[PDB]
Amino acid sequence: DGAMDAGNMLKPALARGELHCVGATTLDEYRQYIEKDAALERRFQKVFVAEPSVEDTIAILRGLKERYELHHHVQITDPAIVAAATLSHRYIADRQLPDKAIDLIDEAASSIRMQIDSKRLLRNKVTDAEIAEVLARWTGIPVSRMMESEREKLLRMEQELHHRVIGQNEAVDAVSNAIRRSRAGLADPNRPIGSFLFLGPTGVGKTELCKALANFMFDSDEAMVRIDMSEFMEKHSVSRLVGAPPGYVGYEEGGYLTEAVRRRPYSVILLDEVEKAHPDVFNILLQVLDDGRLTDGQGRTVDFRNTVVIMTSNLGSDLIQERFGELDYAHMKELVLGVVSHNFRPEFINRIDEVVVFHPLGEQHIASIAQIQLKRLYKRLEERGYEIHISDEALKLLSENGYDPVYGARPLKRAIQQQIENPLAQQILSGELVPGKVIRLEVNEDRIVAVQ
Amino acid sequence: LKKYTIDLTERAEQGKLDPVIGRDEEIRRTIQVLQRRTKNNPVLIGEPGVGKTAIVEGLAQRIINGEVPEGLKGRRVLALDMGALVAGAKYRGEFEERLKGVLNDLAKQEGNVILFIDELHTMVGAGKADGAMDAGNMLKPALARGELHCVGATTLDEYRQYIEKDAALERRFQKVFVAEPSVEDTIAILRGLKERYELHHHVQITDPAIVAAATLSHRYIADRQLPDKAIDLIDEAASSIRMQIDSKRLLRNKVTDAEIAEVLARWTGIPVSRMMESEREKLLRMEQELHHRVIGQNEAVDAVSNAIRRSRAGLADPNRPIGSFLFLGPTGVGKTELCKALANFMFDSDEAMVRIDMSEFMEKHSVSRLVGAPPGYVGYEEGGYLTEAVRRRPYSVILLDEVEKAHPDVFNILLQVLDDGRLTDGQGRTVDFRNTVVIMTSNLGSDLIQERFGELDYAHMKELVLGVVSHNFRPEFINRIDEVVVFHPLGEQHIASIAQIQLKRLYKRLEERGYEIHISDEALKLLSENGYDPVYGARPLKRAIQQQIENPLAQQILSGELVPGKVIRLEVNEDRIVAVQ
Amino acid sequence: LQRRTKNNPVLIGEPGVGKTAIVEGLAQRIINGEVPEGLKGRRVLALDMGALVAGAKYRGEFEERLKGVLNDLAKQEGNVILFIDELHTMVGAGKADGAMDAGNMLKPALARGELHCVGATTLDEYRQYIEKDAALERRFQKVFVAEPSVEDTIAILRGLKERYELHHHVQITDPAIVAAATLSHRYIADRQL
Numbered sequence A: 001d002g003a004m005d006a007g008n009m010l011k012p013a014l015a016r017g018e019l020h021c022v023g024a025t026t027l028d029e030y031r032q033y034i035e036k037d038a039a040l041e042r043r044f045q046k047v048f049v050a051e052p053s054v055e056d057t058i059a060i061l062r063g064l065k066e067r068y069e070l071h072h073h074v075q076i077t078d079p080a081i082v083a084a085a086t087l088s089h090r091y092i093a094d095r096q097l098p099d100k101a102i103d104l105i106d107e108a109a110s111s112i113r114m115q116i117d118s119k120r121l122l123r124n125k126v127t128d129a130e131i132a133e134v135l136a137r138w139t140g141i142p143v144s145r146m147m148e149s150e151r152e153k154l155l156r157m158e159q160e161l162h163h164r165v166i167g168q169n170e171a172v173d174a175v176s177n178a179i180r181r182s183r184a185g186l187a188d189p190n191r192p193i194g195s196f197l198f199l200g201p202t203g204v205g206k207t208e209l210c211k212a213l214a215n216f217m218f219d220s221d222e223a224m225v226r227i228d229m230s231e232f233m234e235k236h237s238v239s240r241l242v243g244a245p246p247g248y249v250g251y252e253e254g255g256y257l258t259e260a261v262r263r264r265p266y267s268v269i270l271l272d273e274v275e276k277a278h279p280d281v282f283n284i285l286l287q288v289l290d291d292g293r294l295t296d297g298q299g300r301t302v303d304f305r306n307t308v309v310i311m312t313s314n315l316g317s318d319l320i321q322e323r324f325g326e327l328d329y330a331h332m333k334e335l336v337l338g339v340v341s342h343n344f345r346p347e348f349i350n351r352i353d354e355v356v357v358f359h360p361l362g363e364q365h366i367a368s369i370a371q372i373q374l375k376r377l378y379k380r381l382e383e384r385g386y387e388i389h390i391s392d393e394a395l396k397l398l399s400e401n402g403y404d405p406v407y408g409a410r411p412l413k414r415a416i417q418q419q420i421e422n423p424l425a426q427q428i429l430s431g432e433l434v435p436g437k438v439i440r441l442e443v444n445e446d447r448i449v450a451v452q
Numbered sequence B: 001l002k003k004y005t006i007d008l009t010e011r012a013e014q015g016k017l018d019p020v021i022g023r024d025e026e027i028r029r030t031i032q033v034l035q036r037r038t039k040n041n042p043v044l045i046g047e048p049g050v051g052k053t054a055i056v057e058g059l060a061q062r063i064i065n066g067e068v069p070e071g072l073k074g075r076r077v078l079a080l081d082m083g084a085l086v087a088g089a090k091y092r093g094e095f096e097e098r099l100k101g102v103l104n105d106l107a108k109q110e111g112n113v114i115l116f117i118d119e120l121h122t123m124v125g126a127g128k129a130d131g132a133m134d135a136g137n138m139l140k141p142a143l144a145r146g147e148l149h150c151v152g153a154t155t156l157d158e159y160r161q162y163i164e165k166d167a168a169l170e171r172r173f174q175k176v177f178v179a180e181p182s183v184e185d186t187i188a189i190l191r192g193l194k195e196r197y198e199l200h201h202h203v204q205i206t207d208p209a210i211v212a213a214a215t216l217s218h219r220y221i222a223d224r225q226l227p228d229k230a231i232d233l234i235d236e237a238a239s240s241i242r243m244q245i246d247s248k249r250l251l252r253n254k255v256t257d258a259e260i261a262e263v264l265a266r267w268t269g270i271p272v273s274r275m276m277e278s279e280r281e282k283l284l285r286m287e288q289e290l291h292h293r294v295i296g297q298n299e300a301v302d303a304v305s306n307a308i309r310r311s312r313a314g315l316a317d318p319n320r321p322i323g324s325f326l327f328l329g330p331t332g333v334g335k336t337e338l339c340k341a342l343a344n345f346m347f348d349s350d351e352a353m354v355r356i357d358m359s360e361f362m363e364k365h366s367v368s369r370l371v372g373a374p375p376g377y378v379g380y381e382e383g384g385y386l387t388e389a390v391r392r393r394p395y396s397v398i399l400l401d402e403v404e405k406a407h408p409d410v411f412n413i414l415l416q417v418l419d420d421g422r423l424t425d426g427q428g429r430t431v432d433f434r435n436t437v438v439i440m441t442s443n444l445g446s447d448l449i450q451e452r453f454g455e456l457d458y459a460h461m462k463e464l465v466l467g468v469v470s471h472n473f474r475p476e477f478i479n480r481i482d483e484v485v486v487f488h489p490l491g492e493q494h495i496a497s498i499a500q501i502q503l504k505r506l507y508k509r510l511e512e513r514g515y516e517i518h519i520s521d522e523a524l525k526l527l528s529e530n531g532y533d534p535v536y537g538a539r540p541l542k543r544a545i546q547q548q549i550e551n552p553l554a555q556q557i558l559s560g561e562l563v564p565g566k567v568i569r570l571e572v573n574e575d576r577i578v579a580v581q
Numbered sequence C: 001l002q003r004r005t006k007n008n009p010v011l012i013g014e015p016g017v018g019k020t021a022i023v024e025g026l027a028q029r030i031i032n033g034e035v036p037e038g039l040k041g042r043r044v045l046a047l048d049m050g051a052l053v054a055g056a057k058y059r060g061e062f063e064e065r066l067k068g069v070l071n072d073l074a075k076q077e078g079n080v081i082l083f084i085d086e087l088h089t090m091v092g093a094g095k096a097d098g099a100m101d102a103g104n105m106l107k108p109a110l111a112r113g114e115l116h117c118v119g120a121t122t123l124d125e126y127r128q129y130i131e132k133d134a135a136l137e138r139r140f141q142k143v144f145v146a147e148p149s150v151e152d153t154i155a156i157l158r159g160l161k162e163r164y165e166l167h168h169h170v171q172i173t174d175p176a177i178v179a180a181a182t183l184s185h186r187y188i189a190d191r192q193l
């Protein structure tokens, strides 16, 4: 109420030296509590304790190794000591280095002790192979050992992305190679896992590849940090990516890009239609794409160096579908990089690890996207109880009425919405197409409707 | 201790905790942190609804059933209530000795107590009556030494709001991320939890209702989690089934997939319920119900009714809006009348529409009233017009009137709205547009449709360009609108029918005043003679009605020459429409 | 109000629509027996946050009496429907110097179904207060109270004309009832119907 606090009562005894006080505040709690009382800050010689090296932490972890080996009854190997101070320095960003190396050492020791009690893979030894299993569970960044079940999944990464992105071989080979470079440990630890400029015509598979990439590593299309850059046409819209400065509304809410990657650092970032953004929004992504370190408005640096940043754009579109049938991919990428040299600054084009040119879909690709978009329709109809069978006569109606070389594979989905589902919804609604019987989609000579 | 903690492990002995299905790796990771030497305090961060409190309640049932490691056998999970810790704590040091009485009673348990602080961010500043912080700071030595075994459970955005501010306390807690489960992983959640909801409601929840509620709420509810938004479909369908058993041959018992869609359609408004009723007939005559208000435009009334029927059959692409139309055509032909007749069909109110008048977006910076200001700018809290109207009512008609009178890259912000059905505010809220009909009326090619619709069929009036520079100049906005309609110019046989539509609007304006109006078939023909201009559509008829009918009629209503009760008859006496009684 | 978990409904709408006059009309279905067998004899208690925060000067005094309400709502064996007019007031109420508000203390009891709470926020007081507390927004099922038609407002006004004829000792005619719902819907724009 009015009585004396502990600051003002030790203030005589601190200055006189009768009190040999040691404090251990943080740098932030010294500023907002002790440094605001400048008469009390006067009495306290601050000994700055720096965050140590990795090599200083391997010496720290080796000393209290036996204090954690005795509590968990495991033996922590020195490969696990070195790979806890190396891996936590790289992959943990919010924490500080003696501690976050001990958290890996302690929880890998705690998990081995779980694996002897709660059940050669029943043995009391913390190896570097399972410090990383704790860190891949801490962070989500798959730094684990990856023995054969996921090793076989991404040896077939291209034909698992070609289940959903038909054609675009040079693009599926570009993103599958960046995930193999990271998961073989060959990726540059400073830059992101991949930086991709997906150029190409419209409707051609370049946002489909990001949705199939995010489906590959996260089993959900909506498991990417999807950022539509056409909401960033204004120069002051970079406040949506990094957040508001201190003093301003929605400053506590943070950014959208930084706060999504600070939560899950192993992400896929889609920057859709990136040329529609203001040219000062790419300046935010300069520090994201090379030495990935986007900073909040709060001043929290976010490590983007475990993300796959994909920037899909529509820029060589007039030049790609005009010249792809007469150029190889080397001369075509050479010619579209001349077009995006006029849109993006050379600073920004130089950060991108792979500028990928998507080719316009031929008639034999759109005949195969017809199979995808119709199997999506059968799964949409077995939810309602109806069983559809397309004819091969009606498949080459949709692969010909849905083939427009300018507009990609969206006319085919539009042909499915118009001459498959538009008359089929009339007949599901009228009741004359009953479930249970297999619905056959034939052609009379030009178009006939479902028959059962 | 027992004054301030609820025992989750004796709640689990008595069966009062819900069964917890899945989360085998989020409970193993929260056990692995709890078995650490120092700083054994696992924090279950996640979105609100994902199952963070149910991990500790499924850890508490795991240390009872003995599916837990030794060392956690026989633990007590004690839910620390921090509203009870700061309850009577008026005087100084009354909270701080309550908190220390808990910490000293946790030390007498010899580490055989797991502490649960649900809503862990409420510990950050709980005493706080003198200056520097009390709880948090008082638990900070015990949390770092490894003496509490304190399981937290915060959301992701109350962790950064409250706990990441105290970076010394954020240190002491190991973030166990609790991801929102799959639609497949929450079917197994709802199956091992339906007996708790079959028993409270005295109903039967069928497994089709379990698969429906996980699938439908994942698709149709956007501001909800996983297990949380699928449970309250089977919880509120069962609550509604039990109401129509207890209150008013006439009493079903099962919760089926139809009752799940019936409560999701009352939640969201998106009509996902069932198409067996008398409203299945309303959609078969959608073109007849739209042609009571839109004369002609058959290739447009068919095209906007096919997309409603494609959604109600469940055939619509769930990743795009319901329809995405470009209504091209001349002036006064029924482009905005069809978007008004459609919202009058779907919502039975003409103004029940998110109509954006796109002739206010002639500047590029006007696009931020669709989505709102960014963080830090003025009007950021208000959100956008388009985003907050579709966040509230997700099943909408969005009319974008006169799109060609917008800035040519306001349509960039609709590239995600039409292809993907998403649009993000300045506040970072992604609004789903996948249940909207986005109609975009425009007057492009109006000089081309008025010139060539008699010469060409509709297939050629929609294209008819081999090498000419611009049918539509928009590059890749045009292939994500799913159906482009050319509206045709209204002939005299159409404007004879709009003459009767616009006169029935006039008859209702007069029967609200007590007057009863009769048109002759010659004054109807005289309106359709001089209300027919071809290049101006059907507004010169609405001018010919207000000039040749309503202008003498308003002068004769005010002068008392036409009193109510008697029938007013509009016939031609000389070549003019007079009103006689 | 009759589900197992998280049984907290809210008449979210616009100001004037009839949100407070649903819980005033649910509290009359309860007396007249026009509720199901689970709400027979229940009590709709209207918790005001202005009396809980009033005089809660000391540390704990808001917490003590809000926990005192929750301890006294539990003695009712679940027979009390709680009703918070202006539910956005709770989100932040009692906010001292870092301590949690009424929103965080009611968050365990709202999600378990111990509170059969009813909220009555508008659509934009829910958006700026409760929808920011995303874990409290979860505990509350949005019952969207739509603004009625003119044809539903003449039916409203016909039921209330006996209550306004009695306050003013005037006689309201049914043309005056139809005109007040038809003309205000057309000419008044700032209010809801």
Ligand SMILES: Nc1ncnc2c1ncn2[C@@H]1O[C@H](COP(=O)(O)OP(=O)(O)OP(O)(O)=S)[C@@H](O)[C@H]1O
Pocket (backbone or CB within 6 Å): A164, A165, A166, A167, A168, A201, A202, A203, A204, A205, A206, A207, A208, A209, A312, A313, A314, A361, A369, A372, A408, A409, A410, A413, B476
């Ligand atoms: N190569 C492809 N393989 C399979 N489906 C495809 C392919 N290309 C397009 N599609 C389908 O067509 C839709 C539109 O293609 P997108 O790739 O999303 O458009 P886009 O490639 O981003 O081009 P823009 O510039 O955004 S119009 C996708 O959602 C798929 O369903």
Ligand SMILES: Nc1ncnc2c1ncn2[C@@H]1O[C@H](COP(=O)(O)OP(=O)(O)OP(O)(O)=S)[C@@H](O)[C@H]1O
Pocket (backbone or CB within 6 Å): B018, B019, B020, B021, B022, B023, B047, B048, B049, B050, B051, B052, B053, B054, B055, B153, B154, B155, B189, B193, B227, B228, B231, C005, C111, C135, C136, C138
């Ligand atoms: N794995 C699970 N098994 C069974 N029920 C679950 C599971 N996960 C969640 N639930 C239930 O789904 C609902 C989710 O609510 P809670 O998990 O208690 O809330 P929460 O996850 O703590 O999120 P907040 O931020 O505390 S509101 C509850 O009814 C849980 O019982």
Ligand SMILES: Nc1ncnc2c1ncn2[C@@H]1O[C@H](COP(=O)(O)OP(=O)(O)OP(O)(O)=S)[C@@H](O)[C@H]1O
Pocket (backbone or CB within 6 Å): B293, B294, B295, B296, B297, B330, B331, B332, B333, B334, B335, B336, B337, B338, B401, B402, B441, B442, B443, B490, B498, B501, B537, B538, B539, B542
């Ligand atoms: N085909 C029609 N059927 C019925 N009424 C019509 C028709 N066309 C026009 N009208 C009437 O005339 C008015 C003007 O037509 P609108 O459709 O609103 O203008 P528009 O045809 O959409 O073209 P604009 O000027 O470019 S917005 C409508 O409000 C109706 O009252």
Ligand SMILES: Nc1ncnc2c1ncn2[C@@H]1O[C@H](COP(=O)(O)OP(=O)(O)OP(O)(O)=S)[C@@H](O)[C@H]1O
Pocket (backbone or CB within 6 Å): C014, C015, C016, C017, C018, C019, C020, C021, C022, C120, C121, C122, C156, C159, C160
């Ligand atoms: N369905 C209804 N039946 C009868 N009277 C009603 C109905 N809806 C509203 N009213 C009356 O119309 C007025 C509406 O006021 P309230 O319903 O109290 O305000 P509100 O809906 O709670 O909005 P606020 O300002 O956010 S409290 C009151 O006089 C009610 O008595």
